[model samples]
Target chain A: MKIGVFDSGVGGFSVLKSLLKAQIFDKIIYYGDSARVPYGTKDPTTIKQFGLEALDFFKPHKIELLIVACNTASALALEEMQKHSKIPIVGVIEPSILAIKQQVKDKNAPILVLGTKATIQSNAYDNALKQQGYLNVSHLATSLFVPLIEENILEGELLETCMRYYFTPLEILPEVVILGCTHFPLIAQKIEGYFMEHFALSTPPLLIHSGDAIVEYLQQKYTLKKNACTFPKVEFHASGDVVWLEKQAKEWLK
Target chain B: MKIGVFDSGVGGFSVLKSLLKAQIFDKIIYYGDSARVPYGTKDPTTIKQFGLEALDFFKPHKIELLIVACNTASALALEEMQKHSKIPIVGVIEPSILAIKQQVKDKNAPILVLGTKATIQSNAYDNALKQQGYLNVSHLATSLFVPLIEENILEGELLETCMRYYFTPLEILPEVVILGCTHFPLIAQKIEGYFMEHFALSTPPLLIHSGDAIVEYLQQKYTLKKNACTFPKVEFHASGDVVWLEKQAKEWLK
Candidate 1:
């Protein structure tokens, strides 16, 4: 089936690019809210309306399943956006939460969530993780990570220094760190290394940054489309800078 | 004059609030682009388009002078926005830059610009300062400052620690520091203190954060609406959450 995936910026290409790797669908249509990104810090009302407007962009596409790739939007406005979608809408949060639940041996393990300010404010993961019987959940909004990631400087002096500051506030290390934003997985190694060096643990916290849990979970539940346009065709569209997105896509897809 | 002030979020109220204190105009209409905030990272095209859309919001109000309060928008989209605006428009960057030039004794001395990633990317201050014969201009994207200021926790261990990280990269203190974001000035004392504590100098580097330069500059060119209401009235509008904005207004404006 044709899958519609939406994010606040071209970075959501990671979601579609990963979705394509699974070989579960006939085609993927992606919408990047390039014009107004970083939805993580916006109020729930604007985020809801923006998500609805983004949904309207997909109205003519006849998407069977929708993926909300933005964690902040998922945290704050998923319900409002989902109500407008006829198909089963998926968000990146619950699956990541489930992955944490399945991966950790202890239910009461200390957990940390790193995302944009809006995501942390919504308390989505903190609440969801708690609901699943996990205890000691804490969240830190790493606002600078988005800019560093988008700049594509995964490793550098400033990157390491910034990482140090972000981790300084946490007194104890969590058993697992949920990389709540989709853009985070791109630089998982640096995050992993930072946690490993600072926290006294045998191993670094298991970083949950991928969407594999969601991809795997959806594969069994939904049937694949059996029509023309085989070989998993994908089309990318962005509202802000198609030229810039195209450049980044070439670098990313290359 | 009915001055219209715009920023990416509620923090811009700080700008309008300062303006009101000076009694520079009869009334102020403020628009916060709360939905697509952190305009510091978006592409220039999107920033310009969003500026135009924000302009449309104030089009019916008959504003005499438009103050682009948000540094990111001013740096990236001011010229494009001004081209479309019938009324004279003033951006926050020039006022701050002029303040820097006037306050600094040495034109060739190093100075730093702290702002959103988008504002830094535009190189607006860096370029302007250079054209005005200044040397050793550097810009740091303080992405954390926005969240911390809005959270209303300007002083604390964590807050001081964050300021340290942002300043760590600077080899030596500049002769002057430009509080590049409108929001930055709200917590200017904290930032000024952070610098005073770190970089050793007989006196702290000159800090420029007030809208006084713009207020003075505009006072000369524009005629006040003398026939209108006696007391100044202010209106707050957000593209995000009206309720949340009202709450912020009470906290920040009051």
Candidate 2:
């Protein structure tokens, strides 16, 4: 069965990478809204509208399962999309919550949630964590990372400066740091390095990203274990530039 | 008389800031295509179409002079726009050339041009400079700066990394550096610092930006100076979010 993955832009590549590794699906169809790339900063209504449009794009493909890889869209539009589709729609937020539960057993353990402004504002992660009895949770909107990642300014001094800017004001040293956005997992190592160097953590904090979380969620929920096909085939589509999207898919997926 | 400014995004703030400083127009109507920004990466046909749409947006406002603040749009679409509009359409590229001419007297002086991918690909800056007899010219597309600037990561370590990434490859030490994109002017000081610190130069390279150059161009060509109103009024509009555009206008114009 083909898996349909949707993101505002190349951020979904992080999620797609994990799917490739798991090989549960024989084929994956990716649709990126490159014409209007960053859905993070836009209003919730617009994000929801964009999410519905993405659902429409994947409907003709008749994917068995749909992954709403963009955190902003998942937080704002997942329920609405699920209502409109018979196909099982999976979003990053719930999978992330599950990932955190398996890693951190302590209810009082400090957790840091990092995502775009809209995602943080939606209280998606914070509320879910609270509902699951995680009391010490802090949310930071690291909006700068999306564009930084898009530009492939992933490592080096500029990335470090941005990390410092976002992390400096944190009052809590988190035991678990959720990479709440899919764009985040691409720079998970650098983020881990920053935490190890700056914060006095005994071990590097557990960095949970949507890609791995989605893998875990599918295994547990759907009992999806065996590879459907020997070799997985991937198709890339974009509202703006298919060539640019294909190039990004190659670079990030590799 | 009112002036109209069009940019793909908030990068036009660099040009808008200069207009406000000069107090040439009593009221300035600035339109940003936030939904479809970073026209730098898109195809020429789409950019030209967007430029015409911007032109149509300003028809009701009846701006005496239209400024194509985005270098990509100016490079690709300015000619087509001029053909369609009776009102004079001024772009950043020409003004930058004039500014460079004033500073660098020698025709063979080494010059560096920095812009977006589309602008560089269009050969808008290179062609104009060569036609004007500036023989020794080099171009590098500093695409990362736009996103960094929009995120307001204007100064310090991260900025230094990006500067090194773009500028370190240059074999020629330019006597004149043209900030070909309107967004470049906002970080002109940082760019100057990078050049001064890294490159061995007898004197700091002359940096020319579109904002100051546009001001220069209007004075020479229009010969229309003097405040039309006691206080210049600035209005911002956006295809996506007017509120965000207004906020950006307030911050950058200040």
Candidate 3:
């Protein structure tokens, strides 16, 4: 299967890693909406339009599985995007929800969801989880996380401070923490460490992200359609700076 | 006269302030190379090439006067730009030097020059000042100053500390200081204050920049050949983001 990944920016690279690990796709085409990044700041209408434009960009590629890696887009435009596409479309929202359901033993466990403002406001995770009969879920938009990550800040005083700030005011002790935004996976180690160090050591919150969930979904739904290492590498294109995006991709992936 | 102003990015808005203050132009067109800004990182050849490309962008306008508002381009590519243009092109280098010459009474006064790595490496100011018979002059590339200024640290711990670090090892008490980079003008008052407060009150270094000298040069060379309000508005354009540039210009100019 030829997979297509689209996100408002470079964060989708994290989601693509899961697809690559699954080894079900022969080649992947990733479209980074670098020009109009931080889609969380824009209105839902604008985000939806941008989402369709991204779909249009990948239309010519004729990808079998189109993945909406950006949480903002997944929240605001995924259903509309599914309507626009002929191929089977999967988004991070569904996979992430599936991941949470499988991991958390208690159905009503205090689950924490973190993402950008638009994603949180759209109530994508909360609505979906509530519909799934999970009553105890919390969502917070820790806005600075994506920006800090984009600036190549994996871990430091800035990251630690933001983490402490966002996590400290939690109403309940979360048993499962969903890294709702794709960029969060970049510093997964540091983030996990922060929670462990900040609280008692009996148990740490199980961190769930989109990638492994997507991999799981792909394996169940699709068969591996590949002939040797034909087009084994991913082809990346960005609407903004190709050089900058390529540099970041190489750095993050490497 | 309809004038064309150019810079690697919006920092040239600082230089454009001088032109607007002069109020001699019928209209002004400003082009910012926002896509590949901080030209200090690039090589001389690349910088010169980029300068010529910007020149090519302005050629169709048939500008009466082309003000190379960027320090890097003014240092590295002014002559080459002149060759590439038919219009009377005037870069900041000569005007900045002329400003220094007119302000500093002593030709042998220990004058200081501040700029980025590329501008300093180009040796444009140093060579031009020496050729103009400035016997005693000193130059230092205050790289941290630009970042500090951009980060809006005009006078604080960071700004004062950097100012001290860059200026503490002065060879001689400077009688004049030329703000070689356009960005320096953004924090000119703070820079003057730093020098004034740091040293004896009898003589604070005369901070000379490109605007007044450019006005003098433009007046001396040409007569205003326009009717009443031929082109009153300033039209801004960018090779990068127009919306971003407009926001910045509105903020800076206001």
Candidate 4:
């Protein structure tokens, strides 16, 4: 099956990396909207427009599943994309929230959700959590974290310090943390370290990511075909500068 | 006076913004290495190669003086670019170091220098500080911060948290903090906030940005043409995807 993954920029590569590691999909078509990146900060109308454009780009590839790997798009335009597309269009937001819901059964347990500004501003996580009847939920819009992860600064003392600073503002330590952004999964290890050191809480704050959840959901929902091509010819198409995009993609993926 | 500014990407716009604010230059020719960005993590040889390419592009502009506005390029390729080009090149590293030296006179204050990994790894700040016979210089290679600033996440809660994280590890409070990277001055306010909150260091860290410094240096050193245009007409050019570049530049600059 040809799987399509779309993001504003190279941020989707985190989801792509996760899917690649899962070794489930045979053929993958990756599209990065490098021209207008950080969909997290754009308005819903603009996000929907870009999301439609992204879907149109992936449509020609005959993709069986379209994965909106961007947190901003997934939060804002996932349902809109689903309405228009014939094939199943999955997003990181719902699955991630579902995973978080399962991990935290306690009604009063604090659940810290980190995502982009648009995601936070949209109150996507807050709404989702509230709908699930979870009262103690704090949504922190970590818009810069995605960019930090994109630059591949996952480990080291610097990252650790950054994590502390990010979480220091919260009044209550969450028993569960949802990495609402797909890129957050890339720095999951460091985040885990921060929670462990500062909170010293039990069970290490059930970290839930959307990418893996989506993969699992897709596997159950549809029949995934394994193509014969062992060394899958991974090709990247960007809506902006091809050379610059290619270089960034290679650097991020490698 | 004719002033030249060079950056590996659009981050030079920060320096350009400062220059435009200062209104000191008669003619400003700014060259952005938009072709290949995020030069922070790249090797010194590759950086030097890219620097030479930018210098060659800037040579025909008949610039009286050159400002290596990129932190990575300055750290890696300043000497080489200066030697090859006939025009005088003023780099941020030495000037910033000199600024730091003037501040820390009697006490052995722990100076925290944040810049790209290449700049930190190059030991440009450390070497300059040591050469000036200063001890207790803590250099943290903040390679990730450039992308954050480039993505224009300069303000708000997320960026503030990220800045705090980057600054948290210093062993002691420095009497002077150097915004080592040219892109850093954009986030200087946030960095100040982090330092103030954590260290109780009320005085704003001595931020010696090289943008106006370069303009002043050029005006003092070079001959001025009185009848010339005060504000240079900005022309956009690109090696790949001119359409996208034009659109992005327009949106970003506006």
Candidate 5:
């Protein structure tokens, strides 16, 4: 079936890239609201409105499933957007939460969640963990990291310095660090480097990405529309500049 | 007067902060399209579309003057957007060109311009220099720097490594360089350090920031509606999430 993936911007490419690898869907329509990205920093009302606009754009494609490949939107406005749309909506937030929940079942495992300002503030992950009775969780907002990833500066000393700045305030070291935003997976290597060289944190906090979880969910529930040969018909649409989007897509996808 | 400042994201905050320091404007409306940020990679069509949408949003506010604080937008779509809107538009691109043009007039100064992919590709600065008859110019599409600056990773070894990667390609040492994007100003110190230590290009480039240029233009042309208030009304608008926008505003403006 036609699978639709939407993000505030290029971050959704992470999800799209994973989904393409799974080779389950016939046509994947990727829409980035690049004209107004980073849903993580906006209000619920504004985000909800933007979500509706994205949904409207995707509705015409007649997709069987919709993936809100944005951590900020998933954290703040996924449910509301889902209610309004007819298609099944999957979000990066819940899959990430599920991954964290599974990893932190025993002991007072402190889970560290790094996301955009809106996602961290929404406490979507915190609330999800709390519902499962996991209280020892630390949420740090790495809002700037998203933009950094977009710029493709994932490695080197500058990134390490920034990571130190982000992790400094945490009261306890986390057993599992959940990458709440999809774009963060791009910098997983750098983050891992930071923990290994500087913090030497235990086991590197089980770095989890939502791509696999969403792919598994889609495979189990939906029927493939386009055969494997023509599966990667994913068209990238953005509300912003297409030239920049194309470059990012090529860089990330390659 | 209602002065409008627009950036792809928070980098323009440096300019906004400068404007506040100058104590010229009473009411400031800052719009950061954080959702679709890092417009440097996008194509001209996409940049123009996004710029139009931003202008439309500002149209209702009756802004006395508009400042396109984003280098990507200014480089790619400033003229196109300015043609459609009646309000006086000032972009960071021209001021930067003016500064660089004057510095390199006497000799065939090999100028190095570092900017986002879109900016570099647009060749806006290169063309401006060419128009001023400075042929020995080199432009590097260092799109990755924006993310580094956004993450506040401007110092230490990380930034040094990145500078090495970007600067090594230019075989000939340039007489001057331009921090083409608005974001570059934030990391001027780190950039200075890298240039001094590694390149041995001891004489620093003529760094140009467009904040003063825009302010000067406004003062010379537009009428100021309000000035010198204890607390001027500040409005933050974003096409993405308002909460995230609010948090960023609090962090940057406070």
Candidate 6:
């Protein structure tokens, strides 16, 4: 089966990497609105309009499923988008919550959600986790990380300072950290590294991001079997700067 | 007399801070297009259109002067804007060139120009400096620095990493560095520190930015006298997030 993936910009490339690794689909159609990126800071109405426009882009593709990898879009636009499409519309938040629930058994575990300002303001992940009986959940708007990720500043002094600035406010160090945005998976190593230094632990904290969560969600929900050798083809399209998108895909899809 | 300051976003606030410090204008009308910000990465046509629209906003204000504090807009849109406005429409680039010429008397001084992708690509600084007999001129699109300034990550590990990443490409250290973008003045110290470590310097390299350049240009050309305690009132307006802009003003204006 073929599936469609959508995000505001290159953030979805992270999700696409995971989808490719899962090897469940014969073909994957990926679309990004690179022209008007970082829907995180935009108002809900504009974001919803952009999300619907993206839906229109995917309408003719005839994909069986649609995954909204952009956490801001998923939080604010997914429901509005679903009304216009017949395909199964999956969002990053639900899958992320499921991943956290499955991995962390303790209902009272210290859980932290890191996302863009819009995503945190939406209260989608926080509310969803609370509904799932995850008692000690907190949200921090790590908007700075988005630009750093875009700049490809994955590790080093810059990433460390950003981590410290966001994590400094926490009274309790989170045992379970949710990477609420798709772009965040790019810095999972650094996130884990920061936490490792603070907490005396045998292994790193269970850090979950949309890309990995979506893969796990698809595998179980559809009973999709992973074929390591399938090597499915991905057709990339974007609203703006397709050349930059193409460059990012080559670097990210390794 | 009242003057108008236009920028794509809060980057102009740095220019406004300097404008206030200079105390030339009795009143200042500052406008930030926060909705469609960072005009640096956008196409020239779009930037020009936005520049025209900003001119329209300030047209009715009856300001004697207009300051286009954004370097990308200054490089790409200044000529087009001047055609539409009879008022003295000043941009950051010309003033920047004037400032560099005044400070660095050596015609063959190694001058480095740092700005956004569009500003660097426009070659406004590079060409202008060369015309004035500055033999050694280099340009680097330090686009990553803009977001760091937006995030208020002015110091420490993050700033250091960003400094190293952009400066690593230089074949020879510059005797004079131009802060080609309005946002750059915020991180001048960190930038100077990086260069200081690299070179055996008695004092830091000459750092010139939009705010300071415009101040000097106004002082010399108009023969404006300094009033240290003028305490001018500024009317701050933005296309989006007025609250955030207000908060930033409180912190930055001090």
Best by lDDT: 2
Worst 10 residues of 3 chain A by lDDT: A223-232
The two-chain DockQ for each candidate, comma-separated, is 0.37, 0.42, 0.08, 0.10, 0.38, 0.32
Candidates 4 and 6 compared by DockQ, better number: 6
Identify the runs in model 4 with alpha carbons over 4 angstroms from their true place. Answer: A21-24, A34-52, A79-87, A101-103, A223-234, A238-254, B1-142, B147-181, B186-209, B217-254
How does each model score on lDDT? Answer: 0.78, 0.86, 0.78, 0.73, 0.75, 0.85
Q: List the residue pairs that clash in candidate 6.
A: A158-B158
lDDT of 6 by residue, A88-189 (tens): 999999998998888888999998898998899999988899899987988899998888888778887767877887786667878888888878888998
Lowest lDDT block of 10, candidate 3 chain B: B223-232
DockQ winner between 2 and 6, please give it. 2
lDDT of 4 by residue, B1-254 (tens): 56677876666666666666556666777676654565675667668877788788876788787888787889989999988988788877876665555556753666777788888889988888889887778777776677666566677654665665666676577656677777777777777777777878767665556564554554454553333455665544433234534555554445
Stretches off by above 4 angstroms in model 2 are A83-87, A199-202, B41-46, B62-64, B83-87, B169-171, B200-203
Candidate with the greatest TM-score versus the true structure: 2
Cα-based lDDT at residue B93, candidate 3 = 82
TM-scores for chain A over all candidates: 0.93, 0.97, 0.94, 0.88, 0.92, 0.96
Best by DockQ: 2
- Which lDDT tens digits does candidate 6 get at residues B105-175? 99988889999998999998998988888998989998889878887778877677778888987997888
> Interface Cα RMSD for candidate 5?
4.2
Residue pairs that clash (backbone atoms under 3 angstroms), model 4:
A161-B165, A162-B165
lDDT of 1 by residue, B72-102 (tens): 8888888999899888889988887677767
For model 1 chain B, the run of ten residues with the poorest summed lDDT: B221-230
Question: Would candidate 4 be rated incorrect, acceptable, medium or high by CAPRI criteria?
Answer: incorrect
> Which candidate model has the greater TM-score, 2 or 6?
2
What is the alpha-carbon lDDT for the whole of candidate 1?
A: 0.78
Q: Candidate 5 lDDT (Cα, whole model)?
A: 0.75
Per-residue CA lDDT of model 5 for B127-181, tens digit only, reads 8888888788888877667766666666766566667778767677666767778
Error of 6 at A175 (Å): 3.7
Candidate 3: which stretches are off by over 4 Å? Answer: A7-10, A31-57, A72-84, A101-151, A161-177, A198-203, A221-233, A236-250, B1-254
Q: What tens digits encode model 1's per-residue C-alpha lDDT throughout A1-254?
A: 67888888866766666676676777788788877787876677778888889888898989888898888778887898888778888998888877877788688888889999889988999888888898788889987778667767578665686677678877977878888887888878888888878875557888886476567557646654323334876777888777777677776555
Candidate 6 clash figure, as a count: 1
* Total clashing pairs for each candidate: 3, 1, 0, 2, 23, 1
